Write a structure and sequence with these properties.
It comes from Sphingomonas sp. KT-1. This is Poly(Aspartic acid) hydrolase-1. Keywords: Hydrolase, Signal. The protein is an alpha/beta fold and 266 residues long. It is 29% helix and 18% strand. An eight-stranded mixed beta sheet has the order 1-2-4-3-5-6-7-8. It starts with 5 loop residues before the first strand and ends in a 6-residue tail after the last helix.
Length: 266
Amino acid sequence: PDLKPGAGSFLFTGWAGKPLKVHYYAPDKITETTRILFVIHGAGRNADGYRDAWIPYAKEGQYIVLTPEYSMADFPTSLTYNVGHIVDEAGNPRPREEWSFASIEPMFDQVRKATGSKVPTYAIYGHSAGGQFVHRFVELWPDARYSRAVAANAGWYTMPDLAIKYPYGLKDAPTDAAGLKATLEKPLTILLGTADTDVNHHQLSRTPEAMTQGVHRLARGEFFYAYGRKVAHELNAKFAWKLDYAPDIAHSNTGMSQYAQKLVWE
């Protein structure tokens, strides 16, 4: 069909999962070099706000913004959304095309088909639970066509460790040593707010497995990056991850996006 100039939404059904309402921003003129940025919301499923936060930057960069709404009704738990839904709540394996990750690539096709843009890649950004979604999408979707993925202020990480069990590591995860080696060469950027340091934040995991990564989101992000560098040395991977900071920003998608807007096109 179409995408309307400005802010809007469409219902996406071109995948094996549930229909997804995608809130978008489109520039006034779409050319065939108009870029496309996926913005992934957090646990509050505030997709409408996440698209709005990037509207000014998409207008000044003249690119499309896509924010899928993983509503509470259709994705009630974190396991159904940012953990990827690779198993149901009972532990039974689910088909890969029904994972929450499986919507990005076909959706990336459809919007191109509807706008006329022919860009071979997209950029993707996520904050908090969206940051978990994005770095797990990097770890478990080797086929993805992102030029850069930005994970901002994730609460805790799936660590690049083949001996730690999912979702705290890549043991019992759909990847192996070669896949991990390729993951360490992907253009992933961990962006952390220097004030995301409250060890008692009301959304912060304090499970022992999460505490092995650090006491707050900033420490955990730094430690996840360093662990990636270590295992990249172990596997002789050409380490491509990047570590960036948002000075004096905490767990705020607006403040983090103001800095991430200068990172997704790297």
